[PDB]
Amino acid sequence: SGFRKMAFPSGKVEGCMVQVTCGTTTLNGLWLDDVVYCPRHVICTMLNPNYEDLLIRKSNHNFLVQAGNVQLRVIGHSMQNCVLKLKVDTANPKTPKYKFVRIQPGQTFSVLACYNGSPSGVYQCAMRPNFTIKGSFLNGSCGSVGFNIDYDCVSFCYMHHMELPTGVHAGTDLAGNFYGPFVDRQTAQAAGTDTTITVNVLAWLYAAVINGDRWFLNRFTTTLNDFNLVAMKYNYEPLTQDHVDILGPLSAQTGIAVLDMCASLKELLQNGMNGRTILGSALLEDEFTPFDVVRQCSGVTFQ
Numbered sequence: 001s002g003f004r005k006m007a008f009p010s011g012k013v014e015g016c017m018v019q020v021t022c023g024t025t026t027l028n029g030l031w032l033d034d035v036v037y038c039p040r041h042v043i044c045t046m047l048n049p050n051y052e053d054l055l056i057r058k059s060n061h062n063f064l065v066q067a068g069n070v071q072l073r074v075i076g077h078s079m080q081n082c083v084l085k086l087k088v089d090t091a092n093p094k095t096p097k098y099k100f101v102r103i104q105p106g107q108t109f110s111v112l113a114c115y116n117g118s119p120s121g122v123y124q125c126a127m128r129p130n131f132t133i134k135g136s137f138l139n140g141s142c143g144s145v146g147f148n149i150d151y152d153c154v155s156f157c158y159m160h161h162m163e164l165p166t167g168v169h170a171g172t173d174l175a176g177n178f179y180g181p182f183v184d185r186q187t188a189q190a191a192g193t194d195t196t197i198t199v200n201v202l203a204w205l206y207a208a209v210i211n212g213d214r215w216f217l218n219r220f221t222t223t224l225n226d227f228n229l230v231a232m233k234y235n236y237e238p239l240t241q242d243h244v245d246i247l248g249p250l251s252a253q254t255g256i257a258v259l260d261m262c263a264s265l266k267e268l269l270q271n272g273m274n275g276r277t278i279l280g281s282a283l284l285e286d287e288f289t290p291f292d293v294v295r296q297c298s299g300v301t302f303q
């Protein structure tokens with residue numbers, strides 16, 4: 001019973017994190033086997049810099065890799081796109097199974113904020129339809145990573161870099177390429193007009209039933225052709241036959257069918273909610289995927 005904005009067990013992530021500095025400049029980094037990884041802009045001190053040049057005047061003693069009461073020894077370095085693959089003499093003892101993934105705009109990851117090489121708390125986030133994210137990131141959180149867990153793998157899939165004038169962040173995949181049209185320098189950058197992740201407002205709605213909220217369900221069915229045409233006007237993102245089939249597994253369990261919940265949302269977008277709350281939100285939350293709800297509304301575990 002119940003439903004929360006949970007987040008994965010950030011446990012395996014804490015044992016890989018290392019602080020990294022190169023002057024009056026210190027961020028966070030991620031230690032895997034014998035490499036440390038971090039946003040290549042720790043080497044700077046930001047308008048139109050040129051790290052390629054900056055980095056050819058850098059060394060291996062210029063990088064003080066910090067492992068708490070352990071100093072790690074950059075025996076080598078290089079650069080992949082916008083990440084700094086620092087090689088250190090020692091092999092990370094707390095390294096689990098892992099994969100560098102990239103995620104389609106709409107999915108979800110959890111984040112471990114990290115300060116001076118130290119976890120500060122974990123949260124769950126989602127890749128917005130503009131290739132940005134909404135999180136708590138302060139002056140100091142760079143090098144913090146996003147991750148997902150299928151039991152005993154950690155799918156490293158984001159690394160904080162920068163914040164956009166509206167309050168939103170934007171980082172790289174763990175291979176040095178952002179999500180979006182951004183450059184890790186101090187130039188004029190408008191994030192972009194964002195829409196709603198409709199495939200996730202209806203899975204959340206299903207989670208609302210699973211736990212006894214039915215004031216939005218009805219008897220109407222509807223077609224896509226009209227859903228997608230009513231989705232667009234309230235900025236929502238049209239629905240695919242691809243995104244319906246996933247919900248199917250969750251559609252069966254609830255005796256409803258995916259396009260029956262669709263028209264219920266249409267009557268929510270047109271009328272509102274008029275002073276109620278669906279699952280503790282007087283909003284609609286587009287930040288829950290179907291594999292998230294299956295995961296809480298059954299409890300698939302990880303060890």
Ligand SMILES: *[C@H](O)[C@H](C[C@@H]1CCNC1=O)NC(=O)[C@H](CC(C)(C)C)NC(=O)C(C)(C)NC(=O)OCc1ccccc1
Nearest residue numbers: 041046137138139142161162163169184185186187188189
């Ligand atoms: C990295 O340690 C640090 C993390 C961020 C602090 C708060 N939110 C974060 O995620 N970010 C930076 O130091 C970052 C470095 C560059 C290379 C991106 C400049 N700087 C920023 O994110 C900052 C907040 C200074 N803004 C920025 O990059 O400029 C964007 C901009 C757009 C238009 C006009 C002026 C500035």
